[PDB]
Amino acid sequence: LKIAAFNIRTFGETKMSNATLASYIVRIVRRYDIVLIQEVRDSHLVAVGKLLDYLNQDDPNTYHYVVSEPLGRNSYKERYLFLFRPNKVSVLDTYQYDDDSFSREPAVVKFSSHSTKVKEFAIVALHSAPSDAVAEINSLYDVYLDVQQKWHLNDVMLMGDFNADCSYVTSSQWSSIRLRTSSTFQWLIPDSADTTATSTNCAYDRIVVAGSLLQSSVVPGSAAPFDFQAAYGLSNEMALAISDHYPVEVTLT
Amino acid sequence: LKIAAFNIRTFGETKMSNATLASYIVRIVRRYDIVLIQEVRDSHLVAVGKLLDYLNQDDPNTYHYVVSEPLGRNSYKERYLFLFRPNKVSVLDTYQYDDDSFSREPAVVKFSSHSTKVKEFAIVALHSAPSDAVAEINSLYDVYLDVQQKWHLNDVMLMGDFNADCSYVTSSQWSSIRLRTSSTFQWLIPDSADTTATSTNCAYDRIVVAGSLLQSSVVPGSAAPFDFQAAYGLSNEMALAISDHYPVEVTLT
DNA sequence: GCGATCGC
DNA sequence: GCGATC
DNA sequence: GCGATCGC
DNA sequence: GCGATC
Ligand SMILES: *[C@@H]1O[C@H](CO)[C@H](O)[C@H](O)[C@H]1NC(C)=O
Ligand SMILES: *[C@@H]1O[C@H](CO)[C@H](O)[C@H](O)[C@H]1NC(C)=O
């Protein structure tokens, strides 16, 4: 099973209405069984509708989805969108963590997976606020505890664009982040990875796993950023038109 | 007499050490009798030394100067530098306004001018904080009153990079700015001027005059931004390497 | 400092 | 058009 | 979100 | 290397 987290810069009607752009997004999305799409700025779900239409052109149930409400303290809101192949996994339950620790309160989905060692697991999504990256990543530790009590599940994948490097999270701040220091979690995407399509070299996008079953289901060395620029022979300009971030992915067995 | 205010993006040792860059700065500076240079990030005055050396290669007294101390609340400091031709004008007095209304407290120079209608006038320099543009421009009204009481002088020129347009000062904020609403002042650079070398079209840099004598000394239509890119046949890249702003200038008679 | 979209 | 973001 | 220098 | 800016 292939899972990815993808920050698609300002995913909305404008990008989904460009046929060239749409085609590349569709291509990327089709690589995965489960894909978290962040930065969905689509109050009426018109862009999301268009995407599913493309994905479901040959079989109406190729992909299904779960979408959060528009999240944000002020006028700037984003949804978390989970795309999944219904023949591979099912959604057992979902929940919106709500506390005010986060700009975009984490969306949590409990999945059933027939084809892998782990049979049931949750995914916690987070597109952190660049400005409050340290505190938010640190707050995810409490979300993990929450999920654990709510569903009696230890097998949890924490994923998204954490802004977890470069100017947002410096080297001296790591020690104050419980999600990082705790031995309960395994960070699949290392600090040395480059998850940006831009000129920077930053490990913004992360994949964090907790639980013995989930940890043992991970295929060694499968976790990495997917450089779509290199894969598809695009120019930097074309790559940036799709997104400023690369998806981060992992394979489960 | 020709007076200008020029924000030279990060004026410092790096820019002054590039001979091509230095040459263009020198060319620009030589157009004027009095020139306010902002964004001087030169704690030891090495860049300022180099500039004067160029300017004074043929006659040791071609240009003289007055420099403020490094100004700023925190670690980011800038000096205000006034370059003047000593055969044209003299410095009678200077003063550092100090209150905490400003990020970079205005430097004030009182000049003597033999060749023009106005014989004595002050120049108030301000490189406002982009973020607190409205309040700072509004605070200049109080500085004007200050100068007026200190020296019994009504002939005052307020100049610099006020960040007075586009996202920093919007249309609905103008009415709260006393320097703008008061009939005491004449705004020489209009809102329709473009003072940036970048792609934006903004009237950031301004020239404001108070006092009857000074107002009547102004040559009608002489006040404008000096587009050095167009003047010297530079590429956009070369122009931006010099500065992101154009000098604003005026002629007095 | 810059540039972009959304959602009014 | 422009504010709140990334 | 990005990129630049200074001044440690 | 990195924080405080523009
Ligand atoms: C799609 O976006 C790209 C990359 O930004 C193009 O430049 C193209 O202009 C857009 N769409 C067109 C009209 O088909
Ligand atoms: C001067 O700066 C320019 C413009 O940015 C050049 O690209 C040039 O590389 C610099 N100086 C050189 C070494 O002489």
CB atoms within 10 A of CB B15: 22
CA-nearest residue for atom 14, ligand 1, is: A18
Q: Which two tokens stand for residue B36?
A: 């306010």
In chain A, where are the structural domains located?
A: 1-253
**Residue B85, C-beta contacts closer than 8 angstroms, at least 6 positions apart:** B33, B34, B62, B63, B64
Catalytic center residues of B: 78, 127
* Best CA proximity match to B173, nearest among B131, B126, B135: B135
Residue whose C-alpha is closest to residue B82's, from B74, B90, B215: B90
d(CA B77, CA B81): 13
Q: In this structure, are residues B73 and B103 in contact, taking their beta carbons and an 8 Å threshold?
A: yes
Could you say which ligand is closest to the alpha carbon of residue A17? 1
How far, in Å, are B45, B51, B53 from residue B61 at the CA level? Answer: 18, 13, 10
- Rounded-to-integer distance, Cα B85 and Cα B30, Å: 10
CB–CB of B151/B128 below 8 Å? Answer: no
Resolution in A: 2.0
Which residue has its alpha carbon closest to ligand 2 atom 12?
B18
User: For residue B17, what are its two tokens?
Assistant: 């050490």
How far is C-alpha A204 from the geometric centre of its chain's CA atoms? 11
Is B154 in a helix, a strand, or coil? coil
Which of B73, B81, B133, B140 lies closest to B104 in space, CA to CA?
A: B73
Separation CA A223–CA A243 (nearest Å): 20
Residues whose CB is below 7 A of strand D: A 7, 9, 39, 72-76, 78, 103, 129-131; B 167, 170-172
> Going by DSSP bridges, is the β-strand pair A79-84/A34-40 parallel, antiparallel, or unpaired?
antiparallel
Give the residue numbers of A annotated as catalytic, written as ranges: 78, 127
Beta bridge partners of A166: none
CA distances from B117 to B54, B125, B145, B153, B224 (A): 31, 22, 23, 15, 21
Secondary element (H or E) of residue A94: strand A89-96
Phi, psi angle pair for A180, to nearest 5°: -85, -50
Enumerate residues 6+ apart whose C-beta is below 8 A from B144.
Answer: B124, B156, B158, B179, B184, B185, B210
Task: State how far the Cα of B55 lies from the Cα of B22, in Å rounded to an integer.
Answer: 10
Question: Among A136, A126, A144, A127, which residue's Cα sits nearest to residue A100?
Answer: A136
Q: Domain B1-253, what fold? A: Deoxyribonuclease I; Chain A (3.60.10)
Whole-number Cα distances in Å, B161 to B156, B167, B246 = 17, 14, 10
Q: Which nucleotides of C are covered by protein (CB under 7 A)?
A: 1-8
Q: Which ligand 2 atom minimizes the distance to the CA of B241?
A: 5
